[PDB]
């Protein structure tokens, strides 16, 4: 259409173009060289004197004589449609599955607008993840933000894939229920390696989870702007589905640490003084723009639920990324290196994990009437068991009271049967059954956090129901 050839400066990721006052701030531009190669770029600063283009990828062949710049779009936009389900994209939306491109019902800006706080509604319905340590003890409610705090080499990717394959809604547990409640999973992988990309492709294709999922996979050698755009496109698709087709969307963002490092790199690229520990002073705002895009809206039957996964840089919960994420989100599921290296999978430590919105999404008409008290009793029993397990190393077993030994055995069985479920998929009923079987190992009377009606109804099962087939 129109080409700008007045290029006057190339350095690092930036390119200055003269007489480009027609370019809008934030526009996307194609950059062409003598060889005919076309690169992408974003307008990051427009002035009467010149415009500054941040070039995706590298500038290994550009020259001032032959390079030209052209306009692609005034605003970064994504063409969305319900045919995205079953597709894999690359963080800017270009398909990477080999299938033809989608025909967009509409084209939607990816920097979505804030939700009006008077339009929101209180989360009150849960989504079953299939993992007992979440469903029973750290329940995940629709419209909730519950990140997974992982470490350097813990299996967070496997847990993400399992939650993607197993996540479901349970209308049958909510009164009369509804004939149908559509469900979809959006999967944003930021800064992953070829190994992880292959693993995700295979996991989604070997169980039919692709048919209900949309994958936005950003590799580690792909441009950083793509990394920053990936979560925004994922959430744009999620909001579209949820609030225009009544889907229940679950969004899994694979590595928020990679996103924040990308943000830092680009902030330095735009000549900005870094804030605390090197991160932009506006990192809180960006992370809120990403996270706060989930919720339940009044008068809409859909919902957007978010599980941001981040690796804590040095097992430090005080690092800016985990700190701000916790300061904006509604709990944390924390993975344990001790459980991981003892062979337990999935290695979720119940003690440091929390789900703030759990108490709303558990009870009569959602799950079961005994959920909350069973969870509290499980927490207290496991804590006592761990303490006694450390005391026995000094005092020995013969010097413990019988109740203490029962707590010890309970801790062992809890680790072996509740936390260690493998690739099984457990309904809330099965998880509660296992919880009551484990609680039966303690005398009826140390169960001080559960009412007598529930105890009489459920106490007394045998652990052989799961011990016979872990």
């Amino acid at each position: 259409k129109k080409e700008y050839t007045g290029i006057t400066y190339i350095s690092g990721p930036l390119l200055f173009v003269e007489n480009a006052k027609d370019l809008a701030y934030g526009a996307i531009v194609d950059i062409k060289d003598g060889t005919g190669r076309v690169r992408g770029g974003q307008v990051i600063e427009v002035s009467e004197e010149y415009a500054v283009i941040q070039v995706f990828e590298e500038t290994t062949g550009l020259d001032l004589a032959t390079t030209s710049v052209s306009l692609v779009e005034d605003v970064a936009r994504l063409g969305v449609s319900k045919e995205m389900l079953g597709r894999r994209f690359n963080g800017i939306g270009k398909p990477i599955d080999g299938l033809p491109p989608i025909t967009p019902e509409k084209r939607l800006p990816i920097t979505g607008l804030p939700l009006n706080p008077v339009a929101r509604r209180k989360p009150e319905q849960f989504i079953q993840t299939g993992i007992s340590t979440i469903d029973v003890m750290n329940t995940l409610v629709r419209g909730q933000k519950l990140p997974i705090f992982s470490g350097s080499g813990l299996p967070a990717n496997e847990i993400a894939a399992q939650i993607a394959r197993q996540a479901t809604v349970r209308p049958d547990l909510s009164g009369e229920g509804e004939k149908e409640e559509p469900f979809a999973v959006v999967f944003a992988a930021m800064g992953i390696t070829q190994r992880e990309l292959s693993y995700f492709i295979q996991e989604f294709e070997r169980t039919g989870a692709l048919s209900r999922s949309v994958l936005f996979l950003n590799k580690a050698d792909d441009p950083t702007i793509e990394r920053i755009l990936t979560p925004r496109m994922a959430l744009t698709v999620a909001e579209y589905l949820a609030f225009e087709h009544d889907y229940h969307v679950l969004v899994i963002l694979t590595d928020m640490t990679n996103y924040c490092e990308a943000l830092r790199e680009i902030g330095a690229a735009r000549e900005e003084i870094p804030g605390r520990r090197g991160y932009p002073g506006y990192m809180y705002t960006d992370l809120a723009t990403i996270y706060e895009r989930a919720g339940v809206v009044e008068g809409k039957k859909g919902s957007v639920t978010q599980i941001p996964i981040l690796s804590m840089p040095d097992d430090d919960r005080t690092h800016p990324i985990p700190d701000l994420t916790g300061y904006i989100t509604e709990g944390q599921i924390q993975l344990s290196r001790e459980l991981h290296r003892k062979g337990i999978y999935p290695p979720i430590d119940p003690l440091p994990s929390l789900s703030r919105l759990m108490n709303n999404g558990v009870g009569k008409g959602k799950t079961r009437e005994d959920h909350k008290q069973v969870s509290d009793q499980l927490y207290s029993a496991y804590a006592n068991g761990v303490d006694i397990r450390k005391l026995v190393a000094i005092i020995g077993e013969d010097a413990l009271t019988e109740n203490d030994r029962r707590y010890l055995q309970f801790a062992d069985a809890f680790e072996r049967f509740f936390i260690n479920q493998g690739q099984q998929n457990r309904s809330i009923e099965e998880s509660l059954q296992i919880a009551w079987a484990l609680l039966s190992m303690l005398p009826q009377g140390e169960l001080k956090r559960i009412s007598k009606d529930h105890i009489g109804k459920y106490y007394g099962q045998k652990l052989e129901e799961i011990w016979g087939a872990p």
Partner: protein, 578 residues
């Protein structure tokens, strides 16, 4: 009106040309969309504008028009029962006109311009008027809303419209000079409203909660701070304060809170009942609501808008309770703004002027004599929620340097089912000495000494914990066991308060004084008994302890009887007991 053209766009920062005459910190409209921004710098023929909303799609050459006035709030009828943003944008109307998303450049008026109000004039032609005087009156729910002359207006009245139904925009008093006085006037948010004289913290702010009203009182016009641990019941305590306090109006400011926490606030307050009238409490409340994904400027201006509204209702002659939730989030917004302006950070990235701004916010509170000669007050209760709970954080340290009371909500107490979950070993009030005369005149002449005795008992029982932990309560001797058990009685019968009970939700000072006097009399008689040789296991079986257990739940109109009766039975029990 000053008009220019965009010269440079780089993020939220826009440079405009042809802006000679533009004033510092004025509000400007940028681009065709009319996005609102603030002039933060002037250089030659240029003005630096920081745009509240996102600037994507803007182009060089687009127009920039300056409004000529700083950030201001419309003050007048129609603010009660309203839900606003950090810059006074009515959210219900934005939803009505735009959907479930907030779009760029949505212009909507704070006060509804179509509602009519019943106007009763209180001035006649030829009367002189000065800033703050009452031109007339309008009924707003249960409130005799006074229409005030703006603080910077004087003159002689010429026309006073008769009684009738009028819209806020309609001129209602025209001065001889020609100035037209409407039902509302605009006031800057960063300029404290004028007053004749600030008074002293001589009188109390009765929250209705025994622990706060007795051990850690806050004076009318004072400032308090609460930390927001998760699971400490902060929201319930704040709601009880709103319901049962002696404030005539409540302003609640959420300045960056989580999305679902704000959903909880906006879904729960409409379901709160005003005890004084039985109708909704929102008829007596203004809510400023901001989430973390809303513009940074809105989050920074939230508290200033709230305090300006509180000061307005104060000038009308009311007592207003302002409850700023998560001033830490406001500090985060201030930090981001300072970073974008390329300022030198101090301490944890916060701007060097954080303490000054926080002080200027907290010290607009105070009991006042208004420009109209009436008396009003604004009491502020700000919440500090550091991300990790560390009290060395700059925001908490700066707040504790300026506030007069600190109520330490603790999750450990809530885990023990003790509500309100306020810790009496980290909390403090700096108002008790100034409030002593009021107590001596209004509740009882010996009330301060009784409160001091209760504090001393709690301190003693804290000292004995290191012994009770190693060896159970049964091992302690009779005197120490009496101390432990009088502490238990205090905690369970005077410091605990069920916010969901019909009668116990509110306690008057007389009720608290009676309960304290009963407990201390029981302790005196029990010490006498122990010195006489009565085993403590016998003391704990007395039904008088059961009568003290139920004192909380006796009604205010019934408590006096119950009280002298129970005192008589306290004297009877130990005299009769061998």
């Amino acid at each position: 009106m000053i008009q220019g053209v965009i010269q440079k766009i780089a993020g939220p920062a826009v440079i405009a040309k042809g802006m000679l005459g533009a004033r510092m910190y004025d509000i400007c409209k940028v681009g065709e969309e009319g996005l609102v921004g603030e002039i933060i710098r002037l250089d030659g023929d240029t003005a630096f504008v920081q745009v509240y909303e996102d600037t994507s799609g803007l182009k060089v050459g687009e127009p920039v028009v300056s409004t000529g006035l700083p950030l201001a709030v419309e003050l007048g009828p129609g603010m009660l029962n309203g839900i606003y943003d950090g810059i006074q944008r009515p959210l219900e109307r934005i939803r009505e006109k735009t959907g479930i998303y907030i779009t760029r450049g949505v212009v909507v008026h704070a006060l509804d311009r179509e509602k009519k109000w019943a106007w009763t004039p209180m001035v006649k032609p030829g009367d002189e008027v000065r800033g703050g005087m009452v031109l007339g009156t309008v009924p707003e729910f249960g409130f005799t809303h006074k229409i005030l002359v703006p603080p910077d207006v004087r003159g002689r009245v010429k026309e006073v419209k008769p009684a009738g139904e009028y819209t806020v925009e309609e001129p209602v008093v025209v001065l001889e000079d020609g100035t037209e006085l409407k039902m509302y006037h605009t006031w800057p948010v960063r300029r404290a409203r004028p007053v004749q004289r600030k008074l002293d913290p001589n009188t109390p702010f009765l929250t209705g909660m025994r622990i706060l009203d007795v051990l850690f009182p806050v004076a009318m016009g004072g400032t308090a701070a609460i930390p927001g641990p998760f699971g400490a019941g902060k929201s319930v305590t704040q709601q009880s304060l709103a319901k049962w306090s002696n404030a005539d109006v409540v302003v609640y400011v959420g300045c960056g809170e989580r999305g679902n926490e704000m959903t909880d606030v906006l879904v729960e307050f409409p379901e709160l009942t005003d005890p004084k009238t039985g109708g909704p409490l929102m008829h007596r409340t203004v809510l400023i609501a901001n989430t973390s994904n809303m513009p940074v400027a809105a989050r920074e201006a939230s508290i200033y808008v709230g305090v300006t509204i509180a000061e307005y209702f104060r000038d009308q002659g009311f007592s207003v309770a302002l409850m700023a939730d998560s001033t830490s989030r406001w500090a985060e917004a201030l930090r981001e703004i300072s970073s974008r302006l390329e300022e030198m950070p101090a301490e944890e990235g916060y701007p060097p002027y954080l303490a000054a701004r926080l002080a200027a916010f907290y010290e607009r509170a105070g009991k006042v004599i208004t420009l109209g000669g009436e008396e009003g007050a604004v009491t502020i209760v700000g919440a500090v929620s550091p991300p990790g709970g560390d009290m060395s954080e700059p925001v908490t340290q700066s707040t504790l340097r300026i506030v007069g009371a600190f109520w330490r909500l603790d999750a450990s107490l809530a885990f023990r089912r003790h509500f309100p979950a306020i810790n009496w070993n980290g909390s403090y009030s700096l108002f008790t000495s100034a409030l002593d005369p009021w107590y001596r005149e209004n509740v009882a002449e010996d009330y301060p000494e009784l409160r001091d005795a209760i504090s001393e008992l709690l301190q003693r029982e804290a000292g004995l914990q290191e012994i009770v932990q190693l060896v159970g309560p049964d091992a302690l001797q009779d005197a120490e066991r009496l101390v432990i058990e009088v502490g238990r009685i205090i905690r369970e019968d005077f410091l605990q308060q069920n916010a969901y009970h019909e009668v116990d939700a509110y306690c008057s000072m007389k009720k608290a004084y009676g309960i304290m006097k009963m407990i201390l009399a029981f302790y005196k008689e029990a010490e006498a008994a122990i010195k006489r040789g009565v085993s403590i296991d016998e003391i704990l079986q007395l039904p008088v302890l059961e009568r003290i257990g139920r004192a909380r739940y006796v009604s205010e109109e019934e408590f006096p009887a119950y009280f002298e009766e129970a005192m008589k039975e306290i004297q009877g029990a130990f005299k009769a007991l061998a």
